Amino acid sequence: PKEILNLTSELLQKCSSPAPGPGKEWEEYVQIRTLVEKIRKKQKGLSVTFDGKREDYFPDLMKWASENGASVEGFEMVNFKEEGFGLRATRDIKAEELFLWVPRKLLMTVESAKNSVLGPLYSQDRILQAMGNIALAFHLLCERASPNSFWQPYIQTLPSEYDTPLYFEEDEVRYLQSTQAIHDVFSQYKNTARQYAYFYKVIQTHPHANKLPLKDSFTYEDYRWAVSSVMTRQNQIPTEDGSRVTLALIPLWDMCNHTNGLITTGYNLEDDRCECVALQDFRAGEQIYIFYGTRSNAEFVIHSGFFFDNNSHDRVKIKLGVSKSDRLYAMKAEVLARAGIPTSSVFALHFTEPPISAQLLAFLRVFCMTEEELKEHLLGDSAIDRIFTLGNSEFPVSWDNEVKLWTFLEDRASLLLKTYKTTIEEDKSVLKNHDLSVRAKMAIKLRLGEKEILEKAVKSAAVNREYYRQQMEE
């Protein structure tokens, strides 16, 4: 333990530092990554392992869940080559049919964590109180480490590894260099490392940790596993009394895969159970899917561990705001405030049509607006009506403002596109020609998706600029 404590302290001291700024962002990452590996290298890996194949434990999950009133009828567990494990129908299922439910007593939740062996520490530590997902991850490890716990039949069917970024090789991460997504990756890695270092110290010293099953061994690998298991599986349910909402892991639900559609999941408070209905008709033998949510591709890769290709909800981040150096700053600020729009914020450029939201359009209409136009939108009772047509695409302020607006956006989108290291044809060529690892494929596909969205934004802005200018001439 001396080596671990000495390095643990070093890690906490280094990772607690504020970012150095972008010139050293890659550098910060690899330094933490190196130190984390030095620590992980000296540990045995997971404290608790099981000897069978993952699939060999499915019969116990199914038995255990059926004993507690869960739905175990009409579907079974199979290994799909493309996604890995998931549910398959054994009987035909119709859309909106209830096929799955899970009673509250089988769920792993923060509310239940409060009453487990972790309770005494939960109540004292600030992070466990503040971070729902951390308290849930530690509850999961405590149960994993307890051989007679209620959830062993479920914990035993979880995978030993995940494809989220915490499991990426350095050279796989490298493919994301300069993409927007990498900023969120760097943060995720850094925060995970910090949490481990902090808690390792807490378990070793805090007196309420003396009776925990995690007292003898808490490896980096154990923490990484637990955090990943929560973030790739968790959902939100109401608390027992309906007074608040809380994180939960839901056995025999988290085995459903992802596709496009409507949300089919939710919690039935009256009967105290989680429910799910079929998204689409499935014939026996088909893979069962649910909709995970309207998430971006960066979120799916970073938090859920996979890259979904037909992501109709994908987008990129753009930061805009009104300069304080402007002459009309105060007036623009007043119009935006009246409209409920902040002076500066992060907006998004979307994959699907239209490329911009009404809020961004309204923002930009003010951003490019001149003094006279601002007075029209500020002075007079009619001003309020003018302000609430700003997000309405059929109500341009002036042909001049629309041209300035689309010119501005055309240039911003092009400038962002120019910051990438590779171009579109090159990335497509690599994906087609190289026998890449799965993780490398994700990094590249994600990189490509960001460029494709920006290219579309430029083309659309260019067209609108020409359209409005032509109207100006008439």
């Binding site: 939710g266 949510g293 009404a358 309204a362 997000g391």
Partner: protein, 138 residues
């Protein structure tokens, strides 16, 4: 309960308001579909400070609590109905979800507290009047 009770104030959709709320009105906003009136008893809820995009709402037409992810509080078109003309409403969070006219007054929560109340809907999208900046309710 179809309304949010914090400190000594009750927050309701303005168009669901009754004469009692108007008599005890302390604040209102046409543009947000909100009316705030006083109470005589202390409430139980909390206005969340958090910068979340995710939470749960009670969908009364389904009698279920659904998780949703939402776009921030931008300016959104609201269709004409028996209470309002077609207009844009400010400070409205948007998510894919289920909402029928009877779902108005349903409450959106995250693990930090209340975020907003169902004000608009139809055709797959549910929209909530954001109440996170009504700091004075506390």
């Amino acid at each position: 309960s179809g309304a949010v009770y914090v400190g000594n104030y009750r927050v309701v959709n303005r168009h669901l308001a009754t004469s009692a709320d108007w008599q005890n009105c302390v604040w209102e906003s046409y543009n947000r579909d909100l009316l705030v009136s006083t109470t005589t008893a202390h409430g139980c809820d909390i206005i969340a400070r958090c910068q979340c995009t995710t939470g749960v709402y009670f969908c009364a037409s389904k009698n279920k609590h659904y998780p949703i992810s939402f776009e921030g509080p931008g300016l959104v078109e609201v269709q004409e109905s028996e209470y309002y003309p077609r207009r844009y409403q400010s400070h409205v969070l948007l998510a894919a979800g289920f909402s029928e006219p009877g779902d108005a007054g349903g409450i959106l929560r995250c693990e930090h507290g209340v975020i907003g109340i169902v004000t608009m809907g139809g055709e797959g999208v549910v929209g909530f009047a954001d109440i996170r900046d009504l700091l004075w309710l506390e």
